[PDB]
Write a protein that binds this ligand. Structure first.
Ligand SMILES: C[n+]1cn([C@@H]2O[C@H](COP(=O)(O)OP(=O)(O)OP(=O)(O)OC[C@H]3O[C@@H](n4cnc5c(N)ncnc54)[C@H](O)[C@@H]3O)[C@@H](O)[C@H]2O)c2nc(N)[nH]c(=O)c21
Ligand SMILES: Nc1ncnc2c1ncn2[C@@H]1O[C@H](CSCC[C@H](N)C(=O)O)[C@@H](O)[C@H]1O
Length: 262
């Protein structure tokens, strides 16, 4: 009554027992194996081509199906350690990549490794993108949204980055990948259609994502209907909460390799 499918989903999620939530997080999702790569982020090995974060595999999932084909100048807002930046540098059509994150006592500190094409990567900490001016780009990236147990707080936060991203979409990317932390409220499906009407694109759910978050990524390579695509992911997560759990589909993490300009 009066609630969206996503709203009716997150309510039951907040009422799950500790074990009911633990066994449900990874049930039936796809996940990249990062064990041997975490022994690389600490051994100082920058040559092995490992990923710094799991975001490298997530973006590798999206770029490898035309959901976004980066090129020219690319920009990743909230790069953290640059999981999205180090994969974008391996793309052959891109030239300049710049990452930006604060990395203060509030969040993750950027890491610099030697993945293939690391010379074109510019990751600096100490930036607040909510007070940053938009620069011309051909590929916009944004992975900022922060979880919250209240569907209204996730809404109040997601509209803030979508209003900030409108200044970078005012710089007209050629291919973008914007994360919509909460797309499932009646105010959300409203705005996401309003932005797609003027700037194009569509939303898509990545199998790298957990069952605990309703996050979806607004891409430039998919033209899906908004309300139907969001509701599809809503109904998809609900079925996983009732029956017996299912094993996670493991995969090999990206291997960005090593090298220089080419
Ligand atoms: C940790 N946790 C998260 N969620 C739910 O999953 C959604 C996203 O969960 P997340 O795991 O993706 O979030 P994050 O990326 O920060 O990792 P982590 O698992 O460590 O969760 C930490 C955050 O979850 C929130 N949280 C902690 N405990 C609970 C709880 N009992 N119920 C709801 N939210 C919680 C807190 O705001 C905390 O900051 C949250 O909105 C929440 O409804 C939980 N639900 C139950 N029923 N029991 C839990 O323990 C729980
Ligand atoms: N308001 C803000 N301004 C700048 N960076 C922010 C921000 N809010 C969150 N962030 C940053 O966004 C990052 C998201 S983690 C994403 C990292 C990377 N895109 C990857 O996929 O691997 C966090 O590390 C956090 O530091």
């Amino acid at each position: 009554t009066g609630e969206t499918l996503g709203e009716k989903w997150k309510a039951r999620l907040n009422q799950m027992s500790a074990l009911e939530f633990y066994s449900y997080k990874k049930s039936g999702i796809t996940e990249v194996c990062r064990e041997e790569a975490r022994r690389a982020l600490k051994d100082g090995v920058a040559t092995g081509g490992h990923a710094v974060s799991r975001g490298s595999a997530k973006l590798r999932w999206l770029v490898e199906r035309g959901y976004l084909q980066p090129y020219g100048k690319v920009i990743d807002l909230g790069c953290g350690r640059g999981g999205w930046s180090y994969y974008a540098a391996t793309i052959r059509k891109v030239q300049e990549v710049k990452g930006y994150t604060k990395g203060g006592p509030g969040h993750e500190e950027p890491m610099l490794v030697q993945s293939y094409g690391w010379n074109i990567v510019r990751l600096k900490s100490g930036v607040d993108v909510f007070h940053m001016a938009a620069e011309p780009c051909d590929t916009l990236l944004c992975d900022i949204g922060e979880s919250s147990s209240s569907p209204e707080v996730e809404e109040a936060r997601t509209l803030r980055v979508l209003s900030m991203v409108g200044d970078w979409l005012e710089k007209r990317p050629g291919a973008f990948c914007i994360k919509v932390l909460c797309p499932y409220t009646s105010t959300m499906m409203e705005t996401l259609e309003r932005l797609q009407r003027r700037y194009g694109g569509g939303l898509v759910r990545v199998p790298l994502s957990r069952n605990s978050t309703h996050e979806m990524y607004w891409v430039s390579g998919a033209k899906s209907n908004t309300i139907k695509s969001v509701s599809t992911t809503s109904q998809l997560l609900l079925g996983r909460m009732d029956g017996p759990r299912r094993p996670v589909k493991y995969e090999e993490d990206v291997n960005l390799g090593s090298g220089t300009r080419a």
